[PDB]
Amino acid sequence: VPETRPNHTIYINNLNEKIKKDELKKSLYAIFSQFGQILDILVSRSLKMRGQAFVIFKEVSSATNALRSMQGFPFYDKPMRIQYAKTDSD
């Protein structure tokens, strides 16, 4: 869990796989909006995207504070694991 190139997008895994993707997106917004303006939250029903999401902030500083504060937060009773996203085009 290091600084691996600050990014305005955070990658979340260890998510509760039983939750419907629309609900999960909204619930993510509920807890992450406190750190500043979110452009989008990406969740896929794709198979290799099971307990995963990307939260895209306008500012890199929102992402950094969100990663620092919410590391481990039990979300649907499951502690989330958060890193900076790694550059692909999305």
CATH number of the domain where residue 67 is located: 3.30.70.330
Instruction: Give 86's DSSP letter.
Output: P
Q: Helix H segments across the chain?
A: 21-32, 60-70
Q: How many domains does the chain contain in total?
A: 1
54 contacts 90 by C-beta, under 8 angstroms: yes
Say which residues have a Cβ less than 8 Å from residue 31's Cβ, sequence separation at least 6. 70, 73, 75
Nearest CA to 35 out of 11, 15, 56, 52 is that of 56
- Residue 10, SS3? strand
Resolution to 1 decimal place, in Å:
2.4
The whole domain housing 68 covers 1-90
37 contacts 57 by C-beta, under 8 angstroms: yes
The amino acid present at 12, given as its one-letter code, is I
Burial class (CB in 10 A: 0-12, 13-18, 19+), 12: buried
